[PDB]
C-alpha cells in the first residue's frame, strides 16, 4: 500500500511515481499500455485510451496479462470501470482484417457472424466491389477505417513480411557502423512485435535519431520502401541518410523532386515529397509517367516524415493514391491545432512509441536546454497607439517595440562575446528587415533564392566571423540548419505550439539555451503561454527574465527619444 | 607503480598560433590548458619535473629549466601570454635542447618529451631522421599532440621513439588528450624533509612554501605527507566476506574476526584504506 506506484483513476488516468524502486519495470509497462500526457521529474501521468489498448494487444500481451499486472501495480485496486473498459477494448481486436493481394484491397474476417453484422451499415455497403471476405474499393479506404472504429471492430495493418512470396526482396542491409541507441531499439521492438511489421507513429526528437529508425525499419522489412518528406530539401537528406547507413548503390536511391529525376521509374527506394504525389493540377509529362508507375506497384513500409501535416485536405489524399502494406510515421512534434491528431489514429495507425524528453536529456543524447522568456516593457510612445486601434496594425506595434530591440541587441552581444552561434527567428518580415539592417547581420528573407540561401547558411557554420542570422518562417521544418547554440525568437506566429517545439529542435541538435522575446502588457503575453503549453509537458522549465544583466550600460541602440519617435513614424505609416 | 618522469613540454610559437577555432587566440588556449596540466601532473607524480621550451623563428629557447617547482612553471606561462609569435618553428632545434640536458638523467627514470605543435612546417637546418635514431638510442619517449592536420614526420617521430600522436577535434578533445599524459607508465634518490615550517635541513637555506629543491646545496626538499598519499597500493587491504552490532560505527573481516556493517564495508575499503580492527 506504500509500494506499487500507480493510481488508476475511475475514468482513466494513471499517475506514476517516478521515484519508486520499481519505476523502470512500471514505466516499461505503461508505455506498452497507455499514452503519456505529462512527464515532469517526479510524478508522471499517463492515460488509458481506446487506441492505446489496440497497440497493447498487437504486441504479445493478452487481455489477462494487462488486467493481472494492473492489480500488482495498483495502490488502490482497479475500480471496476477500468476492468470493464480493458475487457471491452481488447476482446474485439483480431476480428476484421484489411489485407491486400495483387493490388486489390480485401476486408477479411474469420468469425462469420461479424460479416453478418458488418454488412448492414449503410456506408460499408457503399465501398464494396472459415474465411469470409468481400472486396472493398481503394478510393474510399479512408471512410471504411472511420466506420470500422465507429462500431468498435477496428482495422489492423499488420504486414506479415517474413513470408509473402509476391514481392522481390531487395538487397537493403544495415551496415555495421550505424549503432542504434537503447531508446531507438525500444521503439523498433514495439513496431516489429511478433515478427510482423505494424503501421504506427513513432515520435522521437529531431536531433535524436528520428531518421536512423526510418532507415533501420526499411532495413528490416526489406521490401520496396517509399520515403515522403515535406520539402525538396528533406528529400535531399533522406538520400544522404540512406547512403550513410544502408549500403545502397546510386542506381536504386531515386528521387522524385522535379529537378534531377535520377530515373525514378523502376527502383527500390523512392524519396519524394507531398504535393508531388498529391499534386491536384495537370502534371508534367515526365511526372505523369512515374505516377502511372507508382500507382500500380504495391509497396511495403511507406515512411511519412512530418506526420503532423498529413491530416490536411491535400496531404491525406496521398494515402489512397499509393498502396502500401505497412505505413510508418516519423515526426518530432505530434501536437497541432484544429484537433486533427485523433484523426491520424486511423490514417496511419496507433501511437507506437514516444520518447521521454527529459530522459534523453539526462543521458546526454539531447542538449540540456535552459528555456527563458525575457519580457520587455512597452515604450510609452508605442502604447499610445496600441490601445487606440484593434484592427491588425497592433501586430506590427508589439513586434517593432523599441524596448524589445534593446533586448535582442544585448542578447546578441552577450553571446558573441562567448563565441556562441545565434539564430534570430522572426516572422512578420517587415520586422525582419528593420532588425537585421540596424545591426548589419545577414537574413534569409524567404523570397531570397536557392543560391544565396545556401551561402549564408554555410558561412554561418564554418566561419567564426559571421555569428548571427535572421531567418523568417523558413526553419519551421526539418531543414539543414547548422547546429545553433542559442536562439532568440522574436514575435513568431500566433498561438501554435507546433512551431515553438520546432524552434526548440534547432537548439538541441547549460550547454545550449534559447530565448523568447515578449513585449509585455500586450496580446503576445497570452500567445507565449499558449506555446509553452506543449513544452511544459516534456519537463521544460521556462524562466522569466524581467531585467537583464546590465542592459543600460552598453552601447544599445534607440537610446534617446528623437530616434525612438522616427520608428513610430515608420511603423504606423504602413497601414 | 609508476616511476619518475622528466617531462619536457614543447610549445609552438608560430605565426599560426594566432588562428581561430579555439579560444580566440590559439596560443592562449594552449597556455590555459597547460597551466591546468602542470597542476594535475605534480599531484599524480610527487617527485617528478617539468621543463617548458618554446620555438619561434627557426630557434628554440628554454623558457624554464628542468625543475620540480609546481609554481615557477605557472607564473612563467602567465608571463608568456603576450608573446609576439613571429616566424615558423623548428623541431630539430627543440629536440636538441631537450636532448642535451635530458641525456644526463639517471637510467631508472622515464624521460619524455611532449610536443604541442600547431604549425605544419618545421624549417630546420639539419636532417630530422638522425635525431630519431638518436632519441631511440637515448630511450627518450617523444609524443606529439597536433593541431588541425597530420604531419608525416610527427608520426615517424611518435611511433619510432615510442610515444603517441593525436590530432585535436575541439577544445574538449584537447583537455582529454592532456589528461592521458598525467598518468605514469608502469635507484635511491637523496631528499631532505622540511621540518620547521619550510626551511632547509642541509644548509639552513630558508625560502618559501615550496617542494622545490635547494638552490644552494642542490638537495631536493619534499614534503613527507605528499609521499604518504601514494602508499596503501603497496601492501593493500583485502576484501571481506558477508553472510546488528558493529565495530566501526557501533550500530566481516577475516584477519582479526571483527564484524562490520554495509556502511562500514564501503568506507574502510574505499576511503579509510586500513582496517580499524587491525590497528589494535
Amino acid at each position: 500500500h506504500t509500494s506499487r506506484p500507480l493510481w488508476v483513476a475511475p475514468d482513466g488516468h494513471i499517475f506514476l511515481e517516478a521515484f519508486s524502486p520499481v519505476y523502470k519495470y512500471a514505466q516499461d509497462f505503461l508505455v506498452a499500455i497507455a499514452e503519456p500526457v505529462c512527464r515532469p521529474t517526479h510524478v508522471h501521468e499517463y492515460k488509458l485510451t481506446a487506441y492505446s489498448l489496440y497497440a497493447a494487444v498487437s504486441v504479445g500481451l493478452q487481455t489477462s496479462d494487462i488486467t493481472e499486472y494492473l492489480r500488482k501495480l495498483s495502490k488502490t485496486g482497479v475500480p471496476d470501470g477500468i476492468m470493464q473498459f480493458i475487457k471491452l477494448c481488447t476482446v474485439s481486436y483480431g476480428k476484421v482484417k484489411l489485407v491486400l493481394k495483387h493490388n486489390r484491397y480485401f476486408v477479411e474476417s474469420c468469425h462469420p457472424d461479424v460479416i453478418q453484422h458488418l454488412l448492414q451499415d449503410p456506408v460499408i455497403r457503399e465501398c464494396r466491389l472459415q474465411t469470409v471476405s468481400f472486396e472493398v474499393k481503394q478510393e474510399m479506404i479512408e471512410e471504411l477505417q472511420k466506420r470500422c472504429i465507429h462500431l468498435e471492430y477496428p482495422l489492423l495493418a499488420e504486414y506479415d513480411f517474413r513470408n509473402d512470396s509476391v514481392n522481390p526482396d531487395i538487397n537493403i542491409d544495415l551496415k555495421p557502423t550505424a549503432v542504434l541507441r537503447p531508446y531507438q531499439e525500444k521503439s523498433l521492438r514495439k513496431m516489429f512485435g511478433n515478427g510482423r511489421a505494424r503501421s504506427g507513429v513513432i515520435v522521437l526528437p529531431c536531433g535524436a535519431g528520428k531518421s536512423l529508425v526510418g532507415v533501420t525499419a526499411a532495413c528490416t522489412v526489406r521490401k520496396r520502401c517509399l520515403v515522403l518528406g515535406n520539402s525538396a530539401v528533406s528529400v535531399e537528406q533522406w538520400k544522404a541518410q540512406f547512403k550513410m547507413w544502408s549500403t545502397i548503390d546510386d542506381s536504386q536511391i531515386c528521387r522524385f523532386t522535379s529537378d534531377a529525376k535520377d530515373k525514378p521509374i523502376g527502383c527500390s527506394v523512392a524519396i519524394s515529397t507531398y504535393s508531388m504525389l498529391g499534386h491536384t493540377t495537370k502534371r508534367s509529362w515526365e511526372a505523369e509517367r512515374v505516377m502511372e508507375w507508382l500507382k500500380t506497384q504495391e509497396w511495403g513500409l511507406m515512411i511519412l516524415d512530418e506526420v503532423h501535416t498529413i491530416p490536411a485536405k491535400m496531404f491525406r489524399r496521398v494515402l489512397t493514391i499509393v498502396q502500401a502494406h505497412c505505413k510508418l510515421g516519423l515526426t518530432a512534434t505530434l501536437v497541432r491545432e484544429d484537433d486533427k491528431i485523433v484523426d491520424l489514429n486511423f490514417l496511419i495507425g496507433p501511437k507506437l512509441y514516444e520518447a521521454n524528453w527529459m530522459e534523453l536529456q539526462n543521458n546526454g543524447y539531447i542538449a540540456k536546454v535552459q528555456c527563458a522568456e525575457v519580457w520587455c516593457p512597452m515604450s510609452p510612445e508605442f502604447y499610445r497607439e496600441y490601445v487606440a486601434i484593434k484592427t491588425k496594425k497592433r501586430i506590427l506595434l508589439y513586434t517593432m517595440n523599441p524596448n524589445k530591440f534593446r533586448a535582442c541587441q544585448f542578447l546578441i552581444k552577450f553571446h558573441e562575446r562567448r563565441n556562441d552561434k545565434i539564430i534570430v527567428f522572426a516572422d512578420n518580415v517587415f520586422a525582419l528587415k528593420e532588425y537585421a539592417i540596424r545591426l548589419n547581420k545577414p537574413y534569409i528573407y524567404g523570397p531570397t533564392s536557392q543560391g544565396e540561401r545556401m551561402q549564408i547558411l554555410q558561412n554561418f557554420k564554418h566561419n567564426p566571423k559571421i555569428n548571427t542570422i535572421f531567418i523568417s518562417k523558413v526553419g519551421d521544418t526539418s531543414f539543414d540548419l547548422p547546429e545553433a547554440n542559442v536562439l532568440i525568437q522574436i514575435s513568431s506566429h500566433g498561438g501554435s505550439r507546433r512551431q515553438e517545439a520546432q524552434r526548440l529542435g534547432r537548439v538541441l541538435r547549460y550547454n545550449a539555451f534559447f530565448y523568447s522575446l515578449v513585449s509585455q502588457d500586450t496580446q503576445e503575453m497570452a500567445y507565449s503561454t499558449k506555446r509553452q503549453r506543449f513544452l511544459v509537458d516534456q519537463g521544460y522549465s521556462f524562466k522569466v527574465i524581467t531585467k537583464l544583466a546590465g542592459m543600460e550600460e552598453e552601447d544599445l541602440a534607440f537610446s534617446t527619444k528623437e530616434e525612438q519617435q522616427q520608428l513610430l513614424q515608420k511603423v504606423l505609416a504602413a497601414t | 607503480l609508476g616511476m619518475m618522469r622528466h617531462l619536457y613540454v614543447v610549445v609552438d610559437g608560430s605565426r599560426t598560433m594566432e588562428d581561430q577555432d579555439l579560444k580566440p587566440n590559439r596560443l592562449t588556449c594552449t597556455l590555459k590548458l597547460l597551466e591546468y596540466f602542470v597542476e594535475e601532473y605534480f599531484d599524480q607524480n610527487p617527485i617528478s619535473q617539468i621543463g617548458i621550451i618554446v620555438t619561434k623563428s627557426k630557434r628554440a629557447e628554454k623558457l624554464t629549466e628542468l625543475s620540480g617547482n609546481p609554481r615557477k612553471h605557472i607564473t612563467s606561462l602567465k608571463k608568456a601570454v603576450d608573446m609576439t609569435c613571429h616566424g615558423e618553428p623548428s623541431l630539430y632545434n627543440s629536440l636538441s635542447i631537450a636532448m642535451q640536458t635530458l641525456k644526463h638523467m639517471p637510467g631508472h627514470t622515464s624521460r619524455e618529451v611532449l610536443i604541442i605543435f600547431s604549425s605544419l612546417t618545421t624549417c630546420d637546418p639539419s636532417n630530422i631522421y638522425d635525431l630519431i635514431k638518436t632519441l631511440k638510442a637515448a630511450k627518450i619517449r617523444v609524443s606529439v599532440i597536433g593541431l588541425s592536420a597530420e604531419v608525416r614526420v610527427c608520426t615517424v617521430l611518435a611511433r619510432e621513439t615510442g610515444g603517441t600522436y593525436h590530432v585535436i577535434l575541439d577544445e574538449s578533445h584537447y583537455k582529454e588528450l592532456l589528461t592521458h599524459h598525467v598518468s605514469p607508465p608502469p635507484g635511491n634518490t637523496e631528499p631532505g624533509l622540511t621540518l620547521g615550517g619550510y626551511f632547509c635541513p642541509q644548509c639552513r637555506a630558508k625560502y618559501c612554501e615550496l617542494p622545490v629543491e635547494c638552490k644552494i646545496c642542490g638537495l631536493t626538499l619534499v614534503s613527507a605527507p605528499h609521499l604518504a598519499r601514494s602508499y596503501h597500493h603497496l601492501f593493500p587491504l583485502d576484501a571481506f566476506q558477508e553472510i546488528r552490532f558493529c565495530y566501526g560505527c557501533q550500530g566481516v573481516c577475516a584477519v582479526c574476526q571483527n564484524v562490520f556493517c554495509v556502511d562500514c564495508d564501503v568506507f574502510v575499503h574505499d576511503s579509510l584504506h586500513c582496517c580499524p580492527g587491525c590497528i589494535h
Binding site: 516593457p377 512597452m378 515604450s379 510609452p380 502604447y383 499610445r384 490601445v387 487606440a388 509585455q520 502588457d521 500586450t522 496580446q523 503575453m525 497570452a526 503561454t529 | -
Partner: protein, 62 residues
C-alpha cells in the same frame, strides 16, 4: 486648488489611463491634471470602476 486621489504606475500603464481620458469610456473629466510620466491624478469616485478596467486589461493576456 483641486482635490484628487493620486495614482503611480508603470509608464506603459500610464498611457492606458490617458487613453480613457480622451475616449469617454467611463466618464468625461477622468484625469484632473497629469503631472509626470509616472504619476497621474484621477478623481475619487471612479477609482473602483477604473480598477476593474485595469483588471480587464490584465486578464486579456491569460
Amino acid at each position: 486648488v483641486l482635490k484628487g486621489v493620486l495614482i503611480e504606475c508603470d509608464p506603459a500603464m500610464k498611457q492606458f489611463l490617458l487613453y480613457l481620458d480622451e475616449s469617454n469610456a467611463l466618464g468625461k473629466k477622468f484625469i484632473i491634471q497629469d503631472i509626470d510620466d509616472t504619476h497621474v491624478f484621477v478623481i475619487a469616485e471612479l477609482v473602483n470602476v477604473l480598477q476593474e478596467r485595469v483588471g480587464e486589461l490584465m486578464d486579456q493576456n491569460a
